[PDB]
Paper text:
The first step in genome replication, the binding of the Origin Recognition Complex (ORC) at origins of DNA replication, triggers a series of highly coordinated steps leading to the assembly of pre-replicative complexes (pre-RCs) in a process that involves CDC6 binding to ORC. ORC and CDC6 then function as an ATP-dependent assembler that first recruits a ring-shaped MCM2-7 hexamer with bound Cdt1 to DNA, and then loads a second MCM2-7 hexamer in a head-to-head orientation, whereby this double hexamer is topologically linked to double-stranded DNA (reviewed in [O'Donnell et al., 2013; Siddiqui et al., 2013; Bell and Labib, 2016]). Here, we report the structure of human ORC in a functionally active, ATP-hydrolysis ready state, providing insight into ATP-dependent protein loading as well as DNA and CDC6 binding. The structure of HsORC reveals a remarkable similarity between two very different ATPases: the replication initiator ORC-CDC6 ATPase and the replication fork DNA polymerase clamp loader.
Numbering used by the authors:
A (entry chain A): 41 to 83, 97 to 164, 188 to 506, 548 to 606, 628 to 657, 676 to 709
B (entry chain G): 284 to 466
The structure:
């Protein structure tokens, strides 16, 4: 459906820019991987190594190991190989893949029964293929997990390869999460030195989170927006549970799609002309549908006479007034983001961060409830009225070097309010100036331009997506809520009441008989209990003769 | 006697939707109180229907992950009995599937909890298969520790769409196999 053409559009635009920005956040770190590796190649029996710290995300970075295979085959410098630790229980498979992989690193770019490989032919490839290069290749042996390396295996290779060295100035990259102490644990001290490491850093999930939100979901490019509740539940699944931008992305598709099956009313979700084409295509059923929802009904409530029926009956004055609702709508959202970034360099500099720190936070709290109505905001007020002076004039002049950088580059508007602010702050650079700019940030921005989700234009539905609960059923995977509350709240209901009641351990003499004091009548409790085994609310337990006892709390 | 049918009907409206989810690479999941047999077999009579629907009941002790991959590969897939090493098996079935495209195979497992499926190898298989896009997975779970055995790598390999699916029906053919001591 049109929304799926829009899906793949947005979708692969998203993972596209994600993988590219992955490649740039790389590029400083990878230009520093080949700049480090070319610093040690710039300047016996010791393996130098490269230690990269990738916090606790697995599959997203396999891309960039494919791209180290590639990129470090590209400089004309090394021929690179990657040894996985789980591939690698014994001492044989590493030297086998060692060499399989540097005879192979010579292959893939040209465009047996693999048992045949052993510890010789690497020592031959940078001898036989090239003994005289003359400039030796690194083979950065990407040990993608060195943490899971078998320690016996680990020292046997760092000692075998170390002993053999400088015929093979191996460097080896470390896929890792934690800090240096843990390497110094699994890799012994003799190894900590043989490795000659220079510690390196790689960016984790949470940064890619806050980045991607600031960029992607909060782009003005794509109209789609999220309600407080699936934003809260999502960023809760990300922050409180699983840190993968993988699960947040797949969850963001599932949000994208999930909404995009809500109702056709989003076909108007597109650029004003892309949407207005759809306006033309609109038919009388949809005319019924816009006649229905609130923020339209609300937009209908502050209305008038006939006019109102040429909304309700004669569709033309509506579809005109749809181009009135929607044009405005996609005007408002721009007027927000322009202004949201604005807020950030103001308050992202600020301490206490009571309202928020990261851009995603302000988006969150701003949209959750009235910033004005919240007192932590007023606290931030008191702060700005306190700081004053040059901290503020520097940070604010950076709000215009940088936010006039946004409206110079990041954002086109051109809204004419922005410009007025801009002139105001130029004039300052040359207190109640800070409080009329903040009051401008208050009445002219927070009051006006930053405003809420539900206080917004008509039709804030379908661009902003409600219905959090079902996704949490379809993602968060909360079976024991529905179970607990179901079995609690009826012969299996009463059965779980007994399985709550009796004591701790319940003897089947006086459990079959206590369930006969308390309660065809038996078979349903043995099926309740055999399920409660299969379910798992009990177990068929031997702690006492003929007993059923729960592992679950 | 009256109520259950309506619910087993309501879930049917998600059905086509699940089909689309099945296209998108995810795999639906039913956490019920009861049995989805009439609903999963109505998913066989209503949605799946068609062809290439593999059925292995996990409360059946009879079928086995090796004979699961045979039962998929022997009759329905028709290619062969799956070769000794299951990784090689899937390499042949896949070099058939990676080569032969656009073949969608819908598999419905009652009670993944098993055995035989307890093996981390068994769910490295189901992990790869249900990770392999051609086929798709609808599992019905009971054991409270069912989410226990699914790790990060597997709940990634299984992209699980979890559904209310609160089901009131027995647990008759699921209940026929379990034996207790009063008899």
């Amino acid at each position: 459906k049109l929304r799926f053409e829009t899906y793949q559009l947005i979708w692969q635009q998203m993972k596209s820019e994600n993988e590219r920005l992955q490649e740039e956040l790389n590029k400083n770190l990878f230009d520093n991987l080949i700049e480090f590796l070319q610093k040690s190649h710039s300047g016996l029996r010791e393996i130098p190594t490269a230690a990269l710290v990738l916090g606790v995300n697995v599959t997203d970075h396999d891309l960039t190991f494919g791209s180290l295979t590639e990129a470090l085959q590209n400089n004309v410098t090394p021929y690179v190989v990657s040894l996985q630790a789980k591939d690698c229980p014994d001492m044989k498979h590493f030297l086998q893949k060692l060499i399989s992989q540097l005879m192979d690193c010579c292959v893939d770019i040209k465009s047996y029964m693999t048992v045949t490989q052993k510890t010789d032919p690497k020592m031959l490839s940078k001898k036989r293929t090239t003994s005289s290069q003359w400039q030796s290749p690194p083979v950065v042996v990407i040990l993608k997990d060195m943490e899971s390396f078998a320690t016996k295996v680990l020292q046997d290779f760092i000692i075998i390869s170390s002993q053999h060295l400088h015929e093979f100035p191996l460097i080896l990259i470390f896929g890792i999460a934690t800090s240096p102490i843990i390497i110094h644990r699994l890799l012994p001290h003799a190894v900590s030195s043989l490795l000659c490491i220079e510690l390196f850093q790689s960016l984790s999930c949470k940064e890619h989170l806050t980045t991607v939100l600031d960029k992607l979901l909060l782009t003005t490019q794509f109209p789609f927006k999220i309600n407080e509740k699936v934003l809260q539940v999502l960023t809760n699944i990300f922050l409180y549970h699983d840190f993968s931008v993988q699960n947040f992305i797949k969850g963001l598709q599932l949000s994208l799609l999930e909404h995009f099956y809500s109702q056709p009313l989003s076909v108007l979700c597109c650029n004003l002309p892309e949407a207005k084409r759809r306006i033309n295509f609109l038919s009388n059923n949809q005319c019924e549908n816009i006649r229905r929802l609130p923020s339209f009904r609300r937009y209908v409530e502050k209305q008038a006479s006939e006019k109102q029926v040429a909304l309700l009956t004669n569709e033309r004055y509506l579809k005109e007034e749809t181009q009135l609702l929607l044009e405005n709508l996609h005007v408002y959202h721009m007027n927000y983001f322009l202004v949201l970034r604005c807020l950030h360099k103001f308050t992202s500099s600020l301490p206490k961060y009571p309202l928020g720190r990261q851009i995603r936070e302000l988006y969150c709290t701003c949209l959750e409830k009235n910033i004005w109505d919240s007192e932590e905001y007023a606290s931030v007020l008191q702060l700005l009225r306190m700081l004053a002076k040059d901290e503020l004039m520097t940070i604010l002049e950076k709000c215009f070097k940088v936010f006039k950088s946004y409206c110079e580059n990041h954002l086109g508007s051109t809204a004419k309010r922005i410009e007025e602010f801009l002139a105001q702050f130029q004039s300052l650079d040359a207190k109640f100036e800070v409080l009329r700019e903040n009051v401008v940030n208050f009445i002219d921005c927070l009051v006006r331009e930053y405003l809420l989700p539900p206080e917004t234009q008509p039709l804030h539905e379908v661009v902003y997506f409600s219905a959090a609960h079902a996704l949490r059923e379809h993602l968060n995977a909360a079976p024991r809520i529905a179970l607990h509350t179901a079995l609690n709240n009826p012969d299996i209901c009463i059965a779980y009441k007994l399985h709550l009641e009796c004591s701790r351990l319940i003897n089947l003499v006086d459990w079959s008989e206590a369930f006969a004091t308390v309660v065809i009548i038996h078979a349903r409790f043995i099926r309740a209990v055999s399920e409660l085994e299969l379910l798992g609310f009990i177990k068929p337990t031997k702690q006492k003769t003929d007993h059923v006892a729960r592992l679950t709390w | 006697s009256a109520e259950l049918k309506q619910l087993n009907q309501q879930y049917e409206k998600l059905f086509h939707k699940w089909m689309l989810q099945l296209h998108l690479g995810f795999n639906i999941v039913l956490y019920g109180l009861g049995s989805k047999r009439d609903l999963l077999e109505r998913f066989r009579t209503t949605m799946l229907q068609d062809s290439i629907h593999v059925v292995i009941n996990g409360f059946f002790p009879g079928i086995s992950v090796k004979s699961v991959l045979n039962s998929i590969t022997e009759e329905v897939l028709d290619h062969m009995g799956t070769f000794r090493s299951i990784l090689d098996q899937l390499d042949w079935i896949v070099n058939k599937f990676k080569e032969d495209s656009s073949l969608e195979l819908f598999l419905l497992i009652h009670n993944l909890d098993s055995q035989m499926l307890r093996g981390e190898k068994s769910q490295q298989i189901i992990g790869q298969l249900s990770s392999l896009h051609n086929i798709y997975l609808i599992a019905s779970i009971d054991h409270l520790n069912a989410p226990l055995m699914w790790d990060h790598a597997k709940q990634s390999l299984f992209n699980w769409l979890w559904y209310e699916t609160t089901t009131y029906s027995p647990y008759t053919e699921e209940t026929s196999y379990e034996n207790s001591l009063l008899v």
